[PDB]
Amino acid sequence: MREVISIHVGQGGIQVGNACWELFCLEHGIQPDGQMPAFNTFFSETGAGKHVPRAVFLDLEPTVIDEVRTGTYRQLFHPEQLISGKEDAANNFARGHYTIGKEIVDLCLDRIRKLADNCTGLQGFLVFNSVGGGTGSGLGSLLLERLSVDYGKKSKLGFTIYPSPQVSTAVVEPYNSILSTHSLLEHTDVAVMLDNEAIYDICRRNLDIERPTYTNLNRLIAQVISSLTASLRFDGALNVDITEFQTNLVPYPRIHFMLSSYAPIISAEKAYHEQLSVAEITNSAFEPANMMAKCDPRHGKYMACSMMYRGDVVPKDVNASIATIKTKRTIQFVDWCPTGFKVGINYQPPTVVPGGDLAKVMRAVCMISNSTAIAEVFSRLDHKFDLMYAKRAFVHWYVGEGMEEGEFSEAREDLAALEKDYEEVGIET
Amino acid sequence: MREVISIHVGQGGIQVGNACWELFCLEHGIQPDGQMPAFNTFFSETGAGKHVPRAVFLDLEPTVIDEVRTGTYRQLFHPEQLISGKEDAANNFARGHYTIGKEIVDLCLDRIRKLADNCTGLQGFLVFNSVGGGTGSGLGSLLLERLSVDYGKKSKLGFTIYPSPQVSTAVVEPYNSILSTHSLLEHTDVAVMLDNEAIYDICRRNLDIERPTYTNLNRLIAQVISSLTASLRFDGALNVDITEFQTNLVPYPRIHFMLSSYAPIISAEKAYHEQLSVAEITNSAFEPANMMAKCDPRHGKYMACSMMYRGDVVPKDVNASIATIKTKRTIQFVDWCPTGFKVGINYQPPTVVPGGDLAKVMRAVCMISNSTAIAEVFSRLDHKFDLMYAKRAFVHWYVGEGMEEGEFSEAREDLAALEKDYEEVGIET
Amino acid sequence: MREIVHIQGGQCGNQIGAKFWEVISDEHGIDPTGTYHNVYYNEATGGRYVPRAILMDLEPGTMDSVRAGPFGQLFRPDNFVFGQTGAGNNWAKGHYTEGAELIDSVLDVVRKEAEGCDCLQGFQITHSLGGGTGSGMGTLLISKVREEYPDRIMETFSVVPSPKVSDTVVEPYNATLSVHQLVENADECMVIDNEALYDICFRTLKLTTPTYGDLNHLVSAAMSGVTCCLRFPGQLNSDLRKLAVNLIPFPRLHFFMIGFAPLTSRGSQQYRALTVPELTQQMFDAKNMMCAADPRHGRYLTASALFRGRMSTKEVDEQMLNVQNKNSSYFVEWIPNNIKSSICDIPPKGLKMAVTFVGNSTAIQEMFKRVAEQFTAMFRRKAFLHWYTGEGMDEMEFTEAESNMNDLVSEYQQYQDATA
Amino acid sequence: MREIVHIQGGQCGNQIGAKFWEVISDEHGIDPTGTYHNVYYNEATGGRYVPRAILMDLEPGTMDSVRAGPFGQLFRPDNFVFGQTGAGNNWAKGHYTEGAELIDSVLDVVRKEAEGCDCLQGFQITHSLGGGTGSGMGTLLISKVREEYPDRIMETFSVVPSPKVSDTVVEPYNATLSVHQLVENADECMVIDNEALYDICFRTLKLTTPTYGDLNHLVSAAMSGVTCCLRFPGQLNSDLRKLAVNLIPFPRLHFFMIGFAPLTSRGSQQYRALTVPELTQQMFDAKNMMCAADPRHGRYLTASALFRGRMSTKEVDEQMLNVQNKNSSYFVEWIPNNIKSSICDIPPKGLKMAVTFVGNSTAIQEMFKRVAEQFTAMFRRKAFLHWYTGEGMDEMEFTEAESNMNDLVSEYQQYQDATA
Amino acid sequence: LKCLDGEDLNQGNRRRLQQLQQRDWIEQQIREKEERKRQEDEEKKAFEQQTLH
C-alpha cells in the first residue's frame, strides 16, 4: 500500500536514475536480471517470475536508452517504459517544450496513467533531471505541467542538476535554466538543488580520489535517494512518510527550494583513523564543505532541517547532539521558526554498492535543509542571464521554434520576484 | 574526563613532537603501528580497534611532515592531522604569518575545532615553535591569535625554542624572534624557554656523549614534557594540574616566562656508582650548570618553583630537602613570596626509549622555575636586534611581504616594556 | 463492576498502550496466549482473555508495532481501526478531512465495546498532543463521546510537546488546537513530557541508553499504579471518581502531574533502604515526576498519594501531615489539608511497596506558556499556516484557541495566590 | 540518638575522612562489606550498615581513590556528589564560580540526610584550608548549613598549613579567606598542622618513612577519641555540647589544639606500662600535641581531657589537681579550676587506656601571627592577586578579612593580660 | 520495575564487537582498493607498451 513513481527525463536524470536503480535492486536482494534468489515501494511483481521497477525513461537521443537496453539490466525494465525519441535536444527549450516534445508527451502520459492504475497506495513522484540541458528542462516542464493539471494532489519531488559557478559544460545553460523556472514554481512541490562542482570537491577531499567521474556523482546521489526513501521501505523507531516533508519543510508553497547534505562520506583508510559517532557525524553534516550545493549557509539562515538517521542509532544521542548544534553561535535559525529539526530514525545501515569507493559504516545521517541562503544562487544566475540577454545572444535559436521571446524577460521577471520573497522571509521580526 | 590538545608548528617543533609521541607511545605500551596489544588524556579510540593521538602537525615545508608520512608511524596518526603547504617560509616572519599561512590556518583551526568537539574535558593546549623558523614563528603566532580569539577560557602552555645567546643556526633569527614576542605574550598565559647550547653542555658534562645531535635533545625534551603531564596521566600521592600549574607560577599576568630543569641525566656508569638520594637530586636540580635555558640564576632571583617528582619518594625527605635548600645562600627568593615552592608527586618512575643514552632511574625531578634572571636572555637577544635594525639590514625581505616595517618598532617597544618590568619587580617592598 | 475502555490513537499512544498491556498482563499474571497463569479484560470462548482496548491509527504500519511485540496476541482483530494514508503530522487531516472517515467506524466499535458492559466507570485514552494523527483523531473522538455519554468520566494519559528537546516543526499548532478542546471536554488530562522522562531516566535511574520502550514502560507503570487502587482490596479503597472529586476545585483546572516511586539503579538498589519515609521523601521531590514544571515554582492546589503494599496506615497519614507542615510554603493555604491519601492492600509483582503521586498543581502553568509562546512566534508570520488553511480551517479557529489557552493559564494565576 | 553527619571535602579532607571511617568501622566491628563483625552509621536492607557521611570534590579523581582504598564499599553511591573542572587550588573558583554550581545539590543531599534523623546533635567537617576545593566549597557549605540549622553545632577538623613545611605557594590567601568565615560560622575549629605530625611520627614513634596515610591515621585516631565518650557508656559521660560549653568562654575564641595519648615506638612497646601517670606526663608535653605552637609561649584558657578505658577516677582527679597546682603559670588565673575531665568505659582497639586532650589555649595566636606575615607581604605586592580578581571576588574582601584576622589575635592577646 | 533491561548492561561487548567488525571490513576494503589501483596501473602500462610499439 506504498509506492512512488520515479520519472527520469533528460540525460543526467536518466544516468543518476540508472545508478539509483542499481543501488535499489542491490539492497533488496534483487538480481540485476530481474529475478530474486520490503519492495512494494519501488519494484513490483510483474505476473511471471521477475520484478519490474516503477519507472519510465524518456529521452530523445537514443544513445543512453540504447546503452540501458544493452547494458547490464536489460531484462530488468519493461520494454515500454524506455521511451526513445528520434532527434536530439540541441540544448534549447522550444525543441523540447513547444515543437518536438509534443510528439512524446501524450505517449508519456499514457504510460504514466498505466503505472498509476497498476498502483494502489500512491505517495508521490521522483523526477530527476538536469536543467542546464535542452530536454531535461523543456520536456520536464511540459511533463510537470501535464501532471499538475492531470493528477493534482500528489506532490512532486524534483531533483534538478543546476549549473555550478565555475565548471561549465554548455554555454546556453543560463537561458534554458531560467526558462524552466516559469514552470518549476507552479507545478513542483519539492525541488532539491544539486550542483556538480560541490560534488566534485566532495569526491576530491573526502573520498581521496583525484580522477572522479559522473558515475561516482550518480552513485552518491543514489545513496542520498535510498536514504530518503528508507523510511517508506524499511523499519524505524520514528518513521517519516512523504507527507511529513510537505508539512514540515514548506512554510509557504512558493518558497520550497531545499538543498541536501549527507554523512559520512569517508573513504576506507580515512575511517580506520576516525571515531565517527553520532555527535561527530551530526557536526560534520552541517559543514558547508559537505553540502551538495554551491552555497555557504554562513551567509544565510535555516528554516527547517529534515534529518534521517539510518543505521543503529539511539534517539537520546540525537536529541543531545541536536541541542548542541542548535546552541552553536555560527549556525543561526530564523526567529519565526524556533524549533526546526525534524528527525527520524531507521534501523538499517547503508548498503554499499559493490565496486564503490565509499566505506561501509554502521550509521549514516541524511539532512535535507530548507534554508534562505540558496536564494543568492538564483541571483547569481540572473547575473549571467543578463550579460547574455543584454546583447540578444542566441535568441534566434529560440524564436525559430515559435517561442515568443516575450517569455524570456518574464522569466527573469518572475524569478526576480522570487528573490524578493526570500528577502521577505529573512526579516527578523 | 580530562584531555589535552597538542599542536606542533615549525620544523624543530615537529621534530621534538615526533620524539615526544615516540616516548608517549612507549610509555603506555601503545605500539607504533597504532593498535594496542591512563591514556584518555592523549589518545582516543578511533572507532575500530586502534588509537589516534590528539595532535595536529602544521608545517608549510613538506620535507619533515612527509618524512613522518612515510616513517614508522604513518599507521598511528590520522592523515588529516598532518598539514603541509607547498614550500617553505625562509625565516622571515611576514611570509608565513600574513600572506601564505592565511589559507592554511583555516583548515588547521577546523581540524582543531573537530578535535575539541571530539574531546570531553579539554584542559589546555601545548604548542611548539622554533621562533627562529619563519614558518614556525609566523604560523604559530597566527594560530595563537586565532585560538585566543576563538576559544578564550581554555589555557595555552607554549614550549618555544629560542636562539642561543652565543651560538646560532641562522642570521635573521633575532628579527623573527622579536616579532613573535607580542603574540606569545598577550595571547598565551605560559611560556617555557629552551635553548640548545644549555642542553648541549648538559649532555657533554653528564652523559659524556661528546658529539650530540638534535635527536638527543628532542628525546630529553620529550622526557621533560612527559614528566610534566605525568600528573594528569597517572596516579599520585600529591597531584598537581595545569589549572593549578598556571595559578601557582604566574604572580602577574604579564610576567610568566619560566625556565625549566630536569634531573637526573646520568648514563649507566654514573648510575650504578650513585647513591641517588632525593636530597642530592633536588640540590642538583638547582645548579645553574644544568639549567635548560642559558642564564646565571644566582645573579638573578627566583619567584616561584614547581617541583614535580616521580618514582618512590618520602615526603619527609622531600620537605627536609626543601628546607635545607631554602637555607642556602646562593639561591635567594624575592621578599613578596615567602612560600616559593610548590611540589607534586606521582607514581610512575621514568620510562626509557631504546635509542637513548639515558639510564633507567627509579626517581626523577622536573623543576619549572619562574624567575627574573630570564630577563637577561631577552637583553642579549634584544642586543642583536639593535645591531641589525640600526642599518635596516634584511628589513626589505620583510617589507616585501606586505608587512610595513613600522611594526618593528612597535614590537621592540613592547619587548622593552618587559625588559624593564622584570628588572623592576626584582626589588624589596 | 466499574469497568473501563482503553482507546489508543497515534504512534506514541499505541506504543504506550502496548507497553501498558504488557505491564497489566505482568501484574494480573496473563501470558500472551490470553489464559490465566473483568475490570480490564473480557472473557471469550475457551477461557480466553481479550483486553477491552480499541486501537486506532491513520497509518497501517503501527500494526506491525502492536501485533509483533510480545503480548500482542491478546487483542482482537476486529478492534483495529487502521486507515491507509496517515495524517502525517497534520492536525486538520485527523479532524476535518480524514478524521471524519474513520471516526464513524471507531465510534461504532467503542459503542459495541461499551454496551457490552453494565457499569461503564469511564474511558481512558492514550495519545499525543503534537502529532497530527493522535491529536486530531483523539480530540474528535473525545468530543463526540463527551457528546454521547455526558455522565462517565474520560481520563487521557496524553503526552505533551517536549519543552526543549523537540522532534517536529509543526508542534505548537497541534498542541494548541488540541488543548482548546481538552480544556473543554476532559476530566483527568494527565500530561507527560519527554524531557522530564529523560531527566528521570538519566538522574533517577542512571541508565545509559533510553529507548522509547523504556519511557513507555515508566509511564505505563505509573498508569497502572494510578488506578490499581480499584482492581484490588484496600484498607481505604478508591476509584477514578474519588480522584476526580478530590483533585479539581474548579471545573477547568484538570491537568495533573504524575510521579512514581521507588526508582533505583544497580548500586542505589544495592544500598537503598525501602521504608515509607524514604518513599515519601523521594516522591515529593522535583525530578521524580513526569512534567518539566519545577513544582517549587508553583503550589499544589491538591495532590493524591496512592500507596500500595502492606504498610502502617498511621505512618502514611502522619507522613502526609508532616510533609504538608514541613514545606508549608510550597503548598496552598486556602484549601486546608490539601493533600489526600489512599491505600491499596497489594503491591506490584516483584515489589513489597510502591507509591503513585498524582498532583493537581499550579506549577504546570509555566508549560502552557512556553509552548504557547512558541505558537506566538510561529503564527505572527503565518509560518506553515497554508497547510491547515487549505484543509478547511479558519484564522479565528486559531486565534480564539490561543486566547483560550491564555485564558486557561491565566485562570491558574487568578486563583493561585488568592485567599480571604 | 544524637546523630552526626560527617561532611568531607577536598583531597586531604577525603583522605582523612576515608581513614577516619575505616578506623571507626574497625572499632564498631564493621567489616568492609557492611555487616556487624545510629550515632554515626545508618541501617540498610538485609542488615547492611552504611555510613552517614557525604563526600564532595570539584574533581572526580578522588572518587576512584575512596572506592579503591579499603573500606570504600560502605559509602552510599548517592552521596558521591562531584564535579569535573576542579577548583584547582584557587579559592574564588571553589567558593564563587564553580563550587557555587554544586552547592545547591550538596545542600539538597544534606537536607535529605538531616530530615531522616530524630535528634541531630550536630555536624562535623574535615577539609584543608589551603586547597581551593576543600577550603572554598567547605566554608560555603558551612555558611549555608549554619544559616540553616542555628540550634545545632558545627565542628570542623580543619588542617591549617604549617608555614615552615610548605606545599603550595598561594596558600596564605586561602588560609585567611577560610579563617574569616570559620570565625563567623563555626564552633570548634580544632586546627592541625603537618609540622607537629612530622615531629611526632619522627621523634615520638621513631618511624622512618612517614606516609601521608600514617599521619592521616593519627588524625583519625584523635578524631575517633574526641567523641567516644558519647557512643559508649561511662562513669562520667560527655558529648559535643558539654564540650562546646566547658571550653569556649567567648563566642569567637573557638580554636582548639588536639592531642592523643599514648604514642610510643614499636621497639619500646614492650617497655614501660600504661597507667594514668605516664598518660598524664605524655599528654601535657609541648611536642606531644598536633599544633606547631609551643604552649610555653603562652597559656591555656581551658583544657578538657577525655579518658577512655577503665581507671580509678580518684587517681585521675588527683593527678589533675597536682598538674594544675604545680603547673599553675600555664593556666590563666581569672578562670578557676580551668581543667576538665570526662571518663568513658571502653578503650579503643588494642590499648586499654587512651587520652584525648583538647585545649583551647591562647598560644595558637602564633599559628595565625606567622600566617598573617605570610599574607601581608604576598598582598601588598598583589602577588598572584589577579587569579582571585578575574573570578568575581573583589580585592576589598581580602583587606577586611585580614582585619578580622588581626582582630581575632588581638582579642586573644587581651585575654593574656586581663588579670584579676 | 526494580530493574529494567532497557538499560544496556553489556555496553562494553557491543562496543568491542562493533570495533572488531569495523576493522575487518576496513581491511577487506583496503585490500580490494589496492588491488583495483594496481590493476589500473598495469592497464596504463599496457597502453604505454602499445604506444611505444
Ligand SMILES: Nc1nc2c(ncn2[C@@H]2O[C@H](COP(=O)(O)OP(=O)(O)OP(=O)(O)O)[C@@H](O)[C@H]2O)c(=O)[nH]1
Ligand atoms: N550529477 C550528474 N550530472 C549529469 C550527468 N549526466 C549529465 N549531467 C548534466 O547534464 C548536463 C548536460 O546537458 P544535458 O543534460 O545532456 O542536455 P539535455 O537536456 O539532457 O538534452 P540531451 O543531451 O539531448 O539529452 C550537464 O550539466 C551535466 O552536469 C550524470 O550522470 N550525473
Ligand SMILES: Nc1nc2c(ncn2[C@@H]2O[C@H](COP(=O)(O)OP(=O)(O)OP(=O)(O)O)[C@@H](O)[C@H]2O)c(=O)[nH]1
Ligand atoms: N632543541 C631542538 N631545536 C631544533 C631542532 N630542529 C630545529 N631546531 C631549531 O629550529 C630553529 C630553525 O628554525 P626552523 O623552524 O627549523 O626553520 P623552518 O621551519 O624551515 O622555517 P622557514 O625556513 O621560514 O620555512 C633552529 O633554532 C633550530 O635549533 C631539534 O630537533 N631540537
Ligand SMILES: Nc1nc2c(ncn2[C@@H]2O[C@H](COP(=O)(O)OP(=O)(O)O)[C@@H](O)[C@H]2O)c(=O)[nH]1
Ligand atoms: N515518551 C515517548 N514519546 C514518543 C514515543 N513515540 C513518539 N513519541 C513522540 O510523540 C510525537 C508524535 O506523536 P505520534 O504518536 O507519532 O502521532 P503522529 O505523529 O500524528 O503520527 C512525537 O513528538 C514523538 O517524538 C514513545 O515511544 N515514548
Ligand SMILES: Nc1nc2c(ncn2[C@@H]2O[C@H](COP(=O)(O)OP(=O)(O)O)[C@@H](O)[C@H]2O)c(=O)[nH]1
Ligand atoms: N596530614 C595530611 N595532609 C594532606 C594529605 N593530603 C594532602 N594534604 C594537604 O592538603 C593540601 C591540599 O589541599 P586540598 O584541598 O586537598 O587540594 P584541592 O582538592 O585541589 O583543593 C595540601 O597542602 C596537602 O599537602 C594527607 O594525606 N595527610
Ligand SMILES: [Mg+2]
Ligand atoms: Mg536532450
Ligand SMILES: [Mg+2]
Ligand atoms: Mg620551515
